[PDB]
Amino acid sequence: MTEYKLVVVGARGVGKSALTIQLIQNHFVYRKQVVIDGETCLLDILDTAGQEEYSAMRDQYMRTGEGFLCVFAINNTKSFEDIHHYREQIKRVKDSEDVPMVLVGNKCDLPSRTVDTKQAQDLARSYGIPFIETSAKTRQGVDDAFYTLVREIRKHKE
Amino acid sequence: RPVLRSVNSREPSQVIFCNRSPRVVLPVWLNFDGEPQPYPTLPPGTGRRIHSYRGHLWLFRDAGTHDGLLVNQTELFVPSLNVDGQPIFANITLPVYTLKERCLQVVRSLVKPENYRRLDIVRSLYEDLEDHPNVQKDLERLTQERIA
Amino acid sequence: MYVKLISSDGHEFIVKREHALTSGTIKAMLTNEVNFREIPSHVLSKVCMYFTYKVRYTNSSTEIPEFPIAPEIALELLMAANFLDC
Amino acid sequence: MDVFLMIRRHKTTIFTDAKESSTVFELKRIVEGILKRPPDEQRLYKDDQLLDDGKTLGECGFTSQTARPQAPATVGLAFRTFEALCIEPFSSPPELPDVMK
Ligand SMILES: Nc1nc2c(ncn2[C@@H]2O[C@H](COP(=O)(O)OP(=O)(O)CP(=O)(O)O)[C@@H](O)[C@H]2O)c(=O)[nH]1
Ligand SMILES: [Mg+2]
């Protein structure tokens, strides 16, 4: 049985922990044995934290992850602009340029959308990674989001 | 504070790393205290768009041997601020090594460090061989050399 | 302007004076003729190949190729380079 | 495109450059300024084939990728009746040390 170490990163307040809680407990106020494409595998979701710390100890913890979920809230334009900074820090620690990655637009159950889905789709095509719109409250796209990253780690590892 | 160190300008400037050397380039960034930090390597003939900041220092070495490399026909690279968004280019090349230093690289790449003193060369070349290049000894030279 | 460089086995190499001045040892010696009693012909020719390589590629501003050194020549070439200061 | 050559005869070897579009007769004129011998008493060869005074060095087999500065090509020279092309060979390096294998 192959294990997958996934990491959820993003701006402060985008829903990193909420997505992880709902993915595991089906609850909205970390390991899960999942069958993806007929393959039994375990999802080891790492701490989401979010505090800014540029130490070698933090780099060592993030370097262990194989796939990264870059999250932004569709109602917060700043969380979308920060996606570039989060993606570059991921490439720096992983020592690679094509890291298994999936862009995630969280909080799509909200009526104050300030980021067009086409803007994220255009950004996703530029980075060569898939994009998925999710909602931790409604569990919309939450399973589609994490599974899609799992498909990227396998395709990356071939 | 060390003279050779980066400034916390926090102003981003897009840089293009171009490796036109037959070596695997190790981009080394001097932090805000003069301590070198390694970064992802560039295979030969490869180019990568880099996110950096104004006033930050960069140097380039061979990823495996830590030989010296040239950026823009110079050893140190400082990007300015992007003029109207135009990114700044960093063209990594091989330096025209001295025939002595070039021979040292070839001998080091063929003999284990334990068997250096087993070669039919003069006793001085043993010390020259085991004086492997590093960033620390070079940083001391570029520090004292930048005085005006 | 050329100079003559004679090896230990009697091979005379005619290189441009600017190219020969690349080494400090030859610069101190020069007249128009220099002899090396301890440098064989196959090693002195390679040094002249470095001379032509160094003068041509010092002014290049985009990319430089690697200077090839065979394993069978490296040790002899290293001692000659150390003696020539180049 | 520049070509880099080793004009060799007996125990003499000249390190010089030229243009791939330059003439063999022009190269003989370069040997004239170095060894003080006219082109009428010179015969330039590529290996064992005589080079005509009208063809270009490229048309003889000396291109930019065959005559790099770090690996120049070899041109034979014979002086005057002409003599047989004789190029004395360079020395040989010793047996590669057991350590470098
Ligand atoms: N409506 C809605 N609210 C959400 C969603 N995801 C998270 N939230 C809300 O956003 C807030 C932050 O959620 P949380 O998961 O803690 O965010 P985070 O990115 O982990 C914040 P930090 O980085 O500081 O730990 C909470 O008030 C939570 O209820 C979502 O999909 N929909
Ligand atoms: Mg959290």
Question: What ranges do the domains of chain D cover?
Answer: 2-100
Q: Which amino acid belongs to residue A84? A: H
Class at the top of the CATH hierarchy for domain D2-100:
alpha beta
Neighbors of chain A with 3 or more C-beta pairs under 8 Å: B
> Experimental technique used?
X-ray
- C78 with B104: Cβ contact below 8 A: yes
Domains belonging to chain C, first-starting first, are: 1-86 (3.30.710.10)
How far apart CA C22 and CA C17 sit, in angstroms, is: 9
How far apart CA A130 and CA A123 sit, in angstroms, is: 10
**B61 phi and psi, to 5 degrees?**
-135, 165
Establish whether residue A137 lines the binding site of ligand 1, counting it when its CB lies within 6 angstroms of any ligand atom: yes
Resolution (A): 2.9
Do the strands C33-35 and D2-9 form a parallel or antiparallel pair, or are they unpaired? unpaired
How far apart CA B28 and CA C65 sit, in angstroms, is: 22
Contact B30, B36 (CB under 8 A): yes
- In sequence order, which ranges of chain B are alpha helices (DSSP H)? 99-108, 123-129, 135-145
Q: Which residue of C has its CA nearest to D68?
A: C53
Chain B residues whose C-beta sits inside 8 Å of any chain A C-beta: 39-41, 48, 51
Question: What ranges do the domains of chain A cover?
Answer: 1-158
How far apart CA D34 and CA D37 sit, in angstroms, is: 8
Please report residues of B whose CB lies closer than 8 A to that of C79: 121-122, 125
On the 0-12 / 13-18 / 19+ scale of CB atoms within 10 A, A151 is middle
* Closest protein CA for atom 14 of ligand 1: A15
Most ligand 1 atoms within 8 A of CB, residue of A29, A30, A47, A48 to mutate: A48
Looking at residue B3, the DSSP 8-state letter turns out to be S
Please report residues of A whose CB lies closer than 8 A to that of B51: 84-85, 88
How far apart CA A142 and CA D5 sit, in angstroms, is: 69
Q: List B132's β-bridge partners, or say none.
A: none
Residue A17 CA to ligand 2 centre (angstroms): 4
Establish whether residue A87 lines the binding site of ligand 1, counting it when its CB lies within 6 angstroms of any ligand atom: no
Contact B16, B77 (CB under 8 A): no
Residue A42 CA to ligand 1 centre (angstroms): 24
DSSP string for residues in chain D: -EEEEEEEEBTEEEEEEEETTSBHHHHHHHHHHHH---GGGEEEEETTEEPPSSSBHHHHT--TTTSBTTB-EEEEEEE-------BPPPP-PPPPPGGG-
CATH topology (fold) of B99-143:
Elongin C; Chain C, domain 1 (1.10.750)
Structural domain A1-158, CATH architecture: 3-Layer(aba) Sandwich (3.40)
* Closest protein CA for atom 27 of ligand 1: A13
How far apart CA A155 and CA A53 sit, in angstroms, is: 31
Establish whether residue A13 lines the binding site of ligand 1, counting it when its CB lies within 6 angstroms of any ligand atom: yes
At A128, is the secondary structure helix, strand, or coil? coil
- Burial readout B78-101 (b: 16 or more C-beta within 10 A, e: otherwise): bbeeeeeeeebebbbbbbbbbbbe
- C73 with D93: Cβ contact below 8 A: yes
Question: What ranges do the domains of chain B cover?
Answer: 12-93, 99-143
Tokens found for residue A107: 């909080």
Homologous superfamily in CATH for domain B12-93: von Hippel-Lindau disease tumour suppressor,  beta domain (2.60.40.780)
Ligand nearest to the CA of A23: 1
Most ligand 1 atoms within 8 A of CB, residue of A8, A9, A12 to mutate: A12
On the 0-12 / 13-18 / 19+ scale of CB atoms within 10 A, B45 is exposed
Residue with tokens 């004129």: D29
On the 0-12 / 13-18 / 19+ scale of CB atoms within 10 A, A31 is exposed
